[PDB]
Amino acid sequence: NAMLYPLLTKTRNTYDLGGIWNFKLGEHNPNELLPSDEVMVIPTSFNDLMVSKEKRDYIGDFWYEKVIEVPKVSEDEEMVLRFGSVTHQAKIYVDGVLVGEHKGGFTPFEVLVPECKYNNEKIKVSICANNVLDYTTLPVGNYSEIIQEDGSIKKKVRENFDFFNYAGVHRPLKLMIRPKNHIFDITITSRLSDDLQSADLHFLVETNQKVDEVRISVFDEDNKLVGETKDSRLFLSDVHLWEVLNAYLYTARVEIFVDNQLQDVYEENFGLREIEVTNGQFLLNRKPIYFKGFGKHEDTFINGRGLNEAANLMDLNLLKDMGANSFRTSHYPYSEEMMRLADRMGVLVIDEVPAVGLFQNNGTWNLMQTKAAHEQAIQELVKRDKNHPSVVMWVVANEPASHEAGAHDYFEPLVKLYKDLDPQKRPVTLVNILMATPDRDQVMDLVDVVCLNRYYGWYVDHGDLTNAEVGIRKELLEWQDKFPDKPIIITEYGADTLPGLHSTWNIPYTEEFQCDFYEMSHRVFDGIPNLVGEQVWNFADFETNLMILRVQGNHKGLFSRNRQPKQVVKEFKKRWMTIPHYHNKKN
Amino acid sequence: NAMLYPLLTKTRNTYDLGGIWNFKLGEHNPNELLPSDEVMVIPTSFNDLMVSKEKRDYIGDFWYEKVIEVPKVSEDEEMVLRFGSVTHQAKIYVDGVLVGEHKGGFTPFEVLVPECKYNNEKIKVSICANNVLDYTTLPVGNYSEIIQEDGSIKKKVRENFDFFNYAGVHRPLKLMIRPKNHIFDITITSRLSDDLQSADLHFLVETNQKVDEVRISVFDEDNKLVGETKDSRLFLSDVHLWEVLNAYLYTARVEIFVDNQLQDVYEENFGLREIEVTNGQFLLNRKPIYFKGFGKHEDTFINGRGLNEAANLMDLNLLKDMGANSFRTSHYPYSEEMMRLADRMGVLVIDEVPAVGLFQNNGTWNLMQTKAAHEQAIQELVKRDKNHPSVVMWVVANEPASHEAGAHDYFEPLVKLYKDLDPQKRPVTLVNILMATPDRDQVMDLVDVVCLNRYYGWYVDHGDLTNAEVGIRKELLEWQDKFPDKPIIITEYGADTLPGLHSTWNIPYTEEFQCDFYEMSHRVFDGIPNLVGEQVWNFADFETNLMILRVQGNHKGLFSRNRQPKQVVKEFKKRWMTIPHYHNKKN
Ligand SMILES: [Mg+2]
Ligand SMILES: [Mg+2]
Ligand SMILES: [Mg+2]
Ligand SMILES: [Mg+2]
């Protein structure tokens, strides 16, 4: 498939197809030439590039089209289109001919270009993207159609989630020339010695056709050979562990040979680190970890949900400076670029599928037709990210109706799928909503870590921190009592805060209240032995749809959308730099 | 004169003439009836009540007029109009007849209503206010006239000071019925015993005609008689001192008798407290005091420079809560209501005449014709405020050209005037500008306390706190060395800060930089033994005129103009509540 990150090797010619494409919101015949009347950038969200609300709110098919000159392709090579993602659905066309299709707006997929065109001068690539969401998609949307009484159908998507339905081609599109017989997947696992000084490496290299020899060379951060094998197994000594905010990455250069000549070559990075959840603790390299960080969003001005590597590094640098150590890919898999960056910077990542909105506005599980999309999402995510040492936990869903009948039957095989697919068998969790109190919830028994989204003082007991403190402490103790050996992580807690709003009277929406809210929250958290992590909502302000509770988007960010700090940022840096990354609160 | 605060006694009927007056910007004949086409409130600034810039920027004569019904006036009584102030100049008319005049917009004055009208049904009061400032007025303005080539003269005042030229009747106007033979002044002094348990009280009661007996009764805060005398002197035991943020006020009920019957009665409050400047220290009740507080302004939205008692109490409550203890009446005498409030709340007050702008945009002292206005300002201020225990120091000028030739000759008799008029002989100071470095300044030898307005890091070394810290420390040590026994007080230091502006890179105008600026400043201040006080500029944002350095007024306030706090307020409360009111930094 297309799990492997696009690389430039001697056997793989990878070209970027980013830039300006002919664009159109509406119907189009791919047998016809899309004019240049409207253009659009790849990669980016198209929404904030539209000046009018009408075109910004567009729902349905929208087209990208461009004539691309064909490079040299040899006899033993094939040519594929590798999409980082297309949001949400896509049909791919080459010279008007349907050639590929994908559903899900946050996972990569590749599409084969017909071999009969490899000697043509040019090919026309048409991308039929679609941003419709319903009860069969992840994330879940409320779809509806209304006739404008002009004879036309106007589509509308009422989001079942708290973020703007940004759409377009958000991630790099690559034109890849690769051998027909190539490496399509590489799985790297390791068993650390008792003294943590040695490691037993296992490699699973998958090819689409037979090969005579699989040679694997391992290089350290000084690019020095530390091991080589033809048997896909290798013992290492004097190893250097991948540590929190102190990353060490090895490189596995995988070469396949046929008839004593190079067939294909690929390089996959990996890190040596151990993960275990036991006795109400989260262990990294056999030491108790305290999560400090953020729930994030792929969201910036202009680009919307589009990839911005500079934004990734800026955010992660701010994360490091504050004394934080982790973040969650809420509420969808982020770019591969972000994951690889997290690997390099030693940042812990809670990896998450777009399973948000599984909640009817009871009887949620008699209406959700998301099973197929949910299974694919888990399969794609694990296959894409399993080699990332930064990935330390999987999320099966964010705030589903886990208190309703049918919830357990829905999630039991999905939790199992994570365990079966992941070669590291990392802990999986479910991000719990406030309606599902310990007594009502019927799904948390399936997961390894209890993740809670709680807003005592904002949603419940609004502006009443006194009564809020009692409520949050009361429920946290209930969770600890119901699951005595499961670690607890707060994955969302915050208060909307507009920059410039001030008061001496602890007023919600002001910068002072955000400080007060978090100060109260932390006082409670520190008294719960099983609470091993705190991730705020959100890192930065982000765009949402139109509703009365949203004051031009979500303002629960510690930073503004332009990455400028709010008053509370200074307070978090004090706390997070006092609490070490390795912090045992069992003592 | 009109030094005594208007009171309601059995011999004094005091009526408030506040409310709606017929108003007109421009020429008017007081022999004629001003129509009600335009109206204006007393008391308030008229400026922000004008919707257009033209009328708001008006310079010249503007009129208030109202027909007022005459109350009962007996044979031995007279009727006067008592203005808290009129800004800046005023001519008062009764039935079209000129009857009083005053120059100076921040001091009280009374005007006698002609006795031939006491039996009339009504009288017409006309107030010809004027807001022109020049080189003969305090504060100093740059006056100019330009012909609009329509045949008319347009006047313009270019302020020589950093605050908006708000004008109008800013303070209560009273209609006072009093005996012809009345008490027109009361001076209260006291000598504290060596054990601070007793006090020798001296009273100087002034009447305009002869009286047979002056009886003075003294009551404590429980309204209990603690002493009485006919000889204007009284010894007190078990006295209760007036303390910083712990005020104790006594009341002197003064009665004058003629032929064994009551002629007039008035009550004047006073406090028992001792002040002395010696050995680089400011002593209150013989203990080293550390000033913590603000340079302020009589400034609020809507009312402008108009009296707002609620605003006074709100500000003083904020002052008390932060751990502060003092403020300065920059740059003009404030309302009597504010002074009396400060007496009640135990807040230290640095009292200041409108001597701001004595600086040519060298040769300042060959152009300033302010001597007469300056002498009157000192006379009026001392006579009005000498009995206030809150008043602990006088200011002779704010940022004058004290480095130019002629400065010493100008200020020497003015400093002397303070010492001669004030029965308590309180310390007097001069607020020094940054251009007048210790080597250049030729006036600070005259004063008892060195007051400095310094902006290292904002005006000099803008956004360079590193080089700013060196500069401020260097000069402060020079001042301490040039005047080894004079206490130093920072009367202005701050940075413009717009609410909502944020950055991680110590950027000027942001809320973070304001914190950084003050943090650096305090580090320096704490290393200077002779520095006995810190007063920030400003307490709150305030209105100024139009110039490129002013982003809609002055934003150096710790609070916004609506009295909402900025980020730095929290930092000041921490520091000011750690440093006691009585704090000796000689140790
Ligand atoms: Mg909460
Ligand atoms: Mg703790
Ligand atoms: Mg300074
Ligand atoms: Mg100190």
Side-chain angles (χ1 to χ4, degrees), chain A residues 1-74 76-190 192-209 211-587, chain B residues 1-74 76-190 192-209 211-587:
Chain A
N1 312 125
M3 45 277 295
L4 258 35
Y5 188 76
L7 282 185
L8 204 225
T9 72
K10 36 173 47 58
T11 62
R12 298 150 90 101
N13 290 337
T14 302
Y15 310 97
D16 183 88
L17 265 34
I20 289 164
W21 289 59
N22 294 323
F23 187 70
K24 184 180 183 302
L25 298 174
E27 304 314 293
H28 173 57
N29 193 341
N31 294 115
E32 301 171 0
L33 226 204
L34 239 202
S36 302
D37 299 342
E38 305 302 326
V39 292
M40 183 51 61
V41 174
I42 293 183
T44 183
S45 298
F46 80 89
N47 308 89
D48 287 14
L49 267 54
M50 318 308 289
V51 186
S52 70
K53 169 180 175 60
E54 263 223 26
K55 299 164 91 63
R56 183 170 186 256
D57 293 348
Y58 176 81
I59 294 298
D61 287 345
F62 57 104
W63 291 78
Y64 296 78
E65 187 173 281
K66 187 177 190 171
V67 180
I68 302 173
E69 177 153 346
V70 177
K72 262 115 47 194
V73 178
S74 72
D76 289 24
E77 288 174 339
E78 61 179 12
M79 182 165 63
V80 306
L81 290 159
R82 205 273 187 176
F83 296 82
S85 67
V86 183
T87 305
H88 292 276
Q89 288 79 212
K91 300 187 220 65
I92 314 305
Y93 301 87
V94 174
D95 295 338
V97 181
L98 180 66
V99 71
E101 192 273 343
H102 184 265
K103 182 180 174 180
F106 307 91
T107 47
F109 62 97
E110 68 185 26
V111 164
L112 170 69
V113 178
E115 193 171 8
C116 63
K117 274 121 175 55
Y118 293 173
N119 285 310
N120 287 10
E121 177 175 286
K122 296 181 168 81
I123 58 174
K124 194 189 73 173
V125 180
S126 299
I127 310 174
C128 181
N130 185 277
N131 58 2
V132 171
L133 295 171
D134 51 36
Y135 298 139
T136 73
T137 62
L138 293 189
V140 180
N142 302 276
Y143 182 76
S144 66
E145 294 179 355
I146 47 181
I147 311 301
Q148 292 179 144
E149 290 165 279
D150 310 334
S152 58
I153 300 96
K154 181 142 119 64
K155 307 132 177 294
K156 185 178 78 72
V157 174
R158 169 170 155 254
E159 304 93 337
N160 233 28
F161 45 87
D162 192 27
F163 59 93
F164 188 74
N165 195 30
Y166 276 118
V169 185
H170 294 143
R171 291 169 196 171
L173 164 61
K174 306 294 182 183
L175 184 70
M176 273 158 39
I177 314 299
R178 68 184 182 190
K180 289 169 181 169
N181 186 18
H182 58 274
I183 309 164
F184 72 91
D185 197 15
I186 297 172
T187 302
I188 307 176
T189 60
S190 64
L192 270 43
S193 64
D194 290 338
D195 56 7
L196 294 174
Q197 299 279 40
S198 297
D200 183 30
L201 298 182
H202 292 257
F203 301 95
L204 183 58
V205 179
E206 303 186 47
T207 59
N208 50 325
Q209 300 172 31
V211 294
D212 296 328
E213 165 189 328
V214 180
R215 181 108 252 212
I216 301 168
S217 325
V218 177
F219 301 86
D220 56 26
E221 296 216 326
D222 294 325
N223 301 329
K224 300 304 176 180
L225 184 65
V226 299
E228 50 177 342
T229 173
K230 302 189 188 67
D231 302 312
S232 296
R233 192 173 183 181
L234 177 65
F235 184 80
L236 281 188
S237 49
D238 83 282
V239 304
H240 303 99
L241 295 183
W242 185 93
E243 277 288 340
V244 47
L245 271 304
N246 185 17
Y248 196 94
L249 297 175
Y250 290 87
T251 305
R253 182 171 181 85
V254 179
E255 299 170 311
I256 55 176
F257 291 89
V258 173
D259 303 333
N260 259 319
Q261 14 207 247
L262 228 203
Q263 178 64 27
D264 184 31
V265 58
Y266 187 92
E267 289 195 344
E268 180 81 342
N269 306 287
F270 65 99
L272 304 179
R273 59 102 183 88
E274 187 168 309
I275 296 172
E276 179 182 0
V277 164
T278 175
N279 197 32
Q281 290 178 318
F282 198 107
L283 271 44
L284 176 68
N285 297 334
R286 304 162 190 175
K287 297 187 300 297
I289 265 288
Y290 191 80
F291 292 89
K292 301 164 295 176
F294 317 91
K296 296 182 96 299
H297 258 307
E298 285 190 314
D299 178 286
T300 57
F301 283 114
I302 305 179
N303 298 75
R305 193 125 289 129
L307 171 65
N308 191 336
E309 300 181 67
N312 297 346
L313 181 53
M314 183 186 191
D315 298 349
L316 252 49
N317 279 344
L318 284 171
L319 186 152
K320 179 173 186 180
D321 181 85
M322 294 178 69
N325 58 27
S326 56
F327 70 94
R328 177 167 60 105
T329 72
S330 41
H331 299 286
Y332 39 81
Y334 290 0
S335 68
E336 300 167 270
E337 287 74 7
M338 178 55 135
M339 297 302 107
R340 297 164 66 89
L341 216 213
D343 287 341
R344 244 276 68 93
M345 295 186 55
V347 175
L348 311 179
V349 173
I350 308 180
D351 219 341
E352 178 170 328
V353 284
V356 53
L358 297 172
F359 200 112
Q360 185 59 71
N361 308 120
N362 357 314
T364 293
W365 307 107
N366 301 335
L367 303 176
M368 293 297 126
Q369 293 291 296
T370 52
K371 182 171 179 290
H374 207 148
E375 291 173 344
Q376 176 188 330
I378 295 182
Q379 292 179 40
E380 288 179 317
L381 181 56
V382 174
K383 274 300 187 64
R384 193 196 70 171
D385 292 5
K386 81 282 187 181
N387 291 337
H388 291 306
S390 63
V391 172
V392 299
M393 182 166 60
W394 309 99
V395 174
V396 73
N398 178 87
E399 298 186 350
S402 59
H403 60 289
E404 303 183 16
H408 189 100
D409 297 334
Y410 181 88
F411 287 109
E412 179 154 17
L414 295 180
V415 171
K416 180 175 171 55
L417 189 58
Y418 265 125
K419 294 295 186 180
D420 292 340
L421 294 178
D422 184 23
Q424 300 189 15
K425 296 183 181 301
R426 271 161 287 209
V428 344
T429 181
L430 185 142
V431 182
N432 171 270
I433 201 177
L434 67 94
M435 288 75 189
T437 36
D439 36 84
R440 226 155 296 173
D441 185 271
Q442 65 165 238
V443 89
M444 216 58 52
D445 63 276
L446 294 169
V447 302
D448 304 285
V449 175
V450 178
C451 286
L452 301 176
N453 288 1
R454 291 308 186 271
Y455 294 91
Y456 285 95
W458 184 257
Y459 287 139
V460 177
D461 297 311
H462 180 79
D464 191 345
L465 300 185
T466 298
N467 287 325
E469 179 173 357
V470 179
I472 181 61
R473 179 178 290 116
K474 193 238 187 63
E475 187 183 1
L476 281 184
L477 289 172
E478 291 183 2
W479 283 105
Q480 190 179 224
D481 146 85
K482 186 181 179 183
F483 299 112
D485 290 326
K486 284 171 172 50
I488 303 179
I489 299 181
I490 309 300
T491 43
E492 284 188 25
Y493 69 124
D496 283 84
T497 304
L498 282 83
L501 262 42
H502 290 284
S503 184
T504 72
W505 307 300
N506 318 95
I507 303 299
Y509 298 97
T510 67
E511 297 196 32
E512 287 77 20
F513 180 83
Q514 188 175 38
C515 294
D516 300 337
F517 173 86
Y518 280 116
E519 187 178 68
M520 179 272 294
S521 297
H522 296 151
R523 188 186 313 121
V524 176
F525 293 174
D526 297 339
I528 312 296
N530 273 9
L531 198 152
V532 299
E534 52 188 49
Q535 288 186 343
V536 316
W537 192 255
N538 192 282
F539 168 78
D541 299 345
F542 59 92
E543 187 65 291
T544 65
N545 54 9
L546 303 192
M547 65 160 302
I548 197 166
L549 289 176
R550 291 292 164 263
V551 191
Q552 192 180 20
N554 188 293
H555 290 283
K556 292 195 179 68
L558 262 46
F559 295 86
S560 295
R561 197 174 180 191
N562 58 10
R563 312 301 130 124
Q564 293 176 351
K566 294 174 188 172
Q567 180 176 134
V568 72
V569 174
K570 280 160 154 37
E571 308 302 323
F572 266 102
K573 185 173 183 177
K574 294 178 183 177
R575 144 167 280 254
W576 282 349
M577 277 171 61
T578 299
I579 302 175
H581 302 311
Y582 295 110
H583 175 68
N584 191 343
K585 47 207 308 255
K586 298 293 188 178
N587 307 99
Chain B
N1 312 125
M3 45 277 295
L4 258 35
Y5 188 76
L7 282 185
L8 204 225
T9 72
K10 36 173 47 58
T11 62
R12 298 150 90 101
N13 290 337
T14 302
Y15 310 97
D16 183 88
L17 265 34
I20 289 164
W21 289 59
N22 294 323
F23 187 70
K24 184 180 183 302
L25 298 174
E27 304 314 293
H28 173 57
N29 193 341
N31 294 115
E32 301 171 0
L33 226 204
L34 239 202
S36 302
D37 299 342
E38 305 302 326
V39 292
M40 183 51 61
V41 174
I42 293 183
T44 183
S45 298
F46 80 89
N47 308 89
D48 287 14
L49 267 54
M50 318 308 289
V51 186
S52 70
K53 169 180 175 60
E54 263 223 26
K55 299 164 91 63
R56 183 170 186 256
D57 293 348
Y58 176 81
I59 294 298
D61 287 345
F62 57 104
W63 291 78
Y64 296 78
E65 187 173 281
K66 187 177 190 171
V67 180
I68 302 173
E69 177 153 346
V70 177
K72 262 115 47 194
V73 178
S74 72
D76 289 24
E77 288 174 339
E78 61 179 12
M79 182 165 63
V80 306
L81 290 159
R82 205 273 187 176
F83 296 82
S85 67
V86 183
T87 305
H88 292 276
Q89 288 79 212
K91 300 187 220 65
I92 314 305
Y93 301 87
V94 174
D95 295 338
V97 181
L98 180 66
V99 71
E101 192 273 343
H102 184 265
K103 182 180 174 180
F106 307 91
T107 47
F109 62 97
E110 68 185 26
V111 164
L112 170 69
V113 178
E115 193 171 8
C116 63
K117 274 121 175 55
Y118 293 173
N119 285 310
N120 287 10
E121 177 175 286
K122 296 181 168 81
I123 58 174
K124 194 189 73 173
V125 180
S126 299
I127 310 174
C128 181
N130 185 277
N131 58 2
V132 171
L133 295 171
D134 51 36
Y135 298 139
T136 73
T137 62
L138 293 189
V140 180
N142 302 276
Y143 182 76
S144 66
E145 294 179 355
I146 47 181
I147 311 301
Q148 292 179 144
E149 290 165 279
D150 310 334
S152 58
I153 300 96
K154 181 142 119 64
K155 307 132 177 294
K156 185 178 78 72
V157 174
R158 169 170 155 254
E159 304 93 337
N160 233 28
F161 45 87
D162 192 27
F163 59 93
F164 188 74
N165 195 30
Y166 276 118
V169 185
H170 294 143
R171 291 169 196 171
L173 164 61
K174 306 294 182 183
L175 184 70
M176 273 158 39
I177 314 299
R178 68 184 182 190
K180 289 169 181 169
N181 186 18
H182 58 274
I183 309 164
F184 72 91
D185 197 15
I186 297 172
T187 302
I188 307 176
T189 60
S190 64
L192 270 43
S193 64
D194 290 338
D195 56 7
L196 294 174
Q197 299 279 40
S198 297
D200 183 30
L201 298 182
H202 292 257
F203 301 95
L204 183 58
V205 179
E206 303 186 47
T207 59
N208 50 325
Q209 300 172 31
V211 294
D212 296 328
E213 165 189 328
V214 180
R215 181 108 252 212
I216 301 168
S217 325
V218 177
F219 301 86
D220 56 26
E221 296 216 326
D222 294 325
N223 301 329
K224 300 304 176 180
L225 184 65
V226 299
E228 50 177 342
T229 173
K230 302 189 188 67
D231 302 312
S232 296
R233 192 173 183 181
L234 177 65
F235 184 80
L236 281 188
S237 49
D238 83 282
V239 304
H240 303 99
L241 295 183
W242 185 93
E243 277 288 340
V244 47
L245 271 304
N246 185 17
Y248 196 94
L249 297 175
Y250 290 87
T251 305
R253 182 171 181 85
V254 179
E255 299 170 311
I256 55 176
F257 291 89
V258 173
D259 303 333
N260 259 319
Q261 14 207 247
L262 228 203
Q263 178 64 27
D264 184 31
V265 58
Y266 187 92
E267 289 195 344
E268 180 81 342
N269 306 287
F270 65 99
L272 304 179
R273 59 102 183 88
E274 187 168 309
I275 296 172
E276 179 182 0
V277 164
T278 175
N279 197 32
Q281 290 178 318
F282 198 107
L283 271 44
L284 176 68
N285 297 334
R286 304 162 190 175
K287 297 187 300 297
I289 265 288
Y290 191 80
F291 292 89
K292 301 164 295 176
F294 317 90
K296 296 182 96 299
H297 258 307
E298 285 190 314
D299 178 286
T300 57
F301 283 114
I302 305 179
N303 298 75
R305 193 125 289 129
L307 171 65
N308 191 336
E309 300 181 67
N312 297 346
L313 181 53
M314 183 186 191
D315 298 349
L316 252 49
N317 279 344
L318 284 171
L319 186 152
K320 179 173 186 180
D321 181 85
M322 294 178 69
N325 58 27
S326 56
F327 70 94
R328 177 167 60 105
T329 72
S330 41
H331 299 286
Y332 39 81
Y334 290 0
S335 68
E336 300 167 270
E337 287 74 7
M338 178 55 135
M339 297 302 107
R340 297 164 66 89
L341 216 213
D343 287 341
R344 244 276 68 93
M345 295 186 55
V347 175
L348 311 179
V349 173
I350 308 180
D351 219 341
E352 178 170 328
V353 284
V356 53
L358 297 172
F359 200 112
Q360 185 59 71
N361 308 120
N362 357 314
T364 293
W365 307 107
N366 301 335
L367 303 176
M368 293 297 126
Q369 293 291 296
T370 52
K371 182 171 179 290
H374 207 148
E375 291 173 344
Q376 176 188 330
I378 295 182
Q379 292 179 40
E380 288 179 317
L381 181 56
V382 174
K383 274 300 187 64
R384 193 196 70 171
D385 292 5
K386 81 282 187 181
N387 291 337
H388 291 306
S390 63
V391 172
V392 299
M393 182 166 60
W394 309 99
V395 174
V396 73
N398 178 87
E399 298 186 350
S402 59
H403 60 289
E404 303 183 16
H408 189 100
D409 297 334
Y410 181 88
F411 287 109
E412 179 154 17
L414 295 180
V415 171
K416 180 175 171 55
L417 189 58
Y418 265 125
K419 294 295 186 180
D420 292 340
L421 294 178
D422 184 23
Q424 300 189 15
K425 296 183 181 301
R426 271 161 287 209
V428 344
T429 181
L430 185 142
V431 182
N432 171 270
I433 201 177
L434 67 94
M435 288 75 189
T437 36
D439 36 84
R440 226 155 296 173
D441 185 271
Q442 65 165 238
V443 89
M444 216 58 52
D445 63 276
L446 294 169
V447 302
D448 304 285
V449 175
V450 178
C451 286
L452 301 176
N453 288 1
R454 291 308 186 271
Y455 294 91
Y456 285 95
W458 184 257
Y459 287 139
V460 177
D461 297 311
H462 180 79
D464 191 345
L465 300 185
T466 298
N467 287 325
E469 179 173 357
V470 179
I472 181 61
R473 179 178 290 116
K474 193 238 187 63
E475 187 183 1
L476 281 184
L477 289 172
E478 291 183 2
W479 283 105
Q480 190 179 224
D481 146 85
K482 186 181 179 183
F483 299 112
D485 290 326
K486 284 171 172 50
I488 303 179
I489 299 181
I490 309 300
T491 43
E492 284 188 25
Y493 69 124
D496 283 84
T497 304
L498 282 83
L501 262 42
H502 290 284
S503 184
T504 72
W505 307 300
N506 318 95
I507 303 299
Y509 298 97
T510 67
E511 297 196 32
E512 287 77 20
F513 180 83
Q514 188 175 38
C515 294
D516 300 337
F517 173 86
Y518 280 116
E519 187 178 68
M520 179 272 294
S521 297
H522 296 151
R523 188 186 313 121
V524 176
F525 293 174
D526 297 339
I528 312 296
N530 273 9
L531 198 152
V532 299
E534 52 188 49
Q535 288 186 343
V536 316
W537 192 255
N538 192 282
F539 168 78
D541 299 345
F542 59 92
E543 187 65 291
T544 65
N545 54 9
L546 303 192
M547 65 160 302
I548 197 166
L549 289 176
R550 291 292 164 263
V551 191
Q552 192 180 20
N554 188 293
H555 290 283
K556 292 195 179 68
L558 262 46
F559 295 86
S560 295
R561 197 174 180 191
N562 58 10
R563 312 301 130 124
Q564 293 176 351
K566 294 174 188 172
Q567 180 176 134
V568 72
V569 174
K570 280 160 154 37
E571 308 302 323
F572 266 102
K573 185 173 183 177
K574 294 178 183 177
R575 144 167 280 254
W576 282 349
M577 277 171 61
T578 299
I579 302 175
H581 302 311
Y582 295 110
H583 175 68
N584 191 343
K585 47 207 308 255
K586 298 293 188 178
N587 307 99

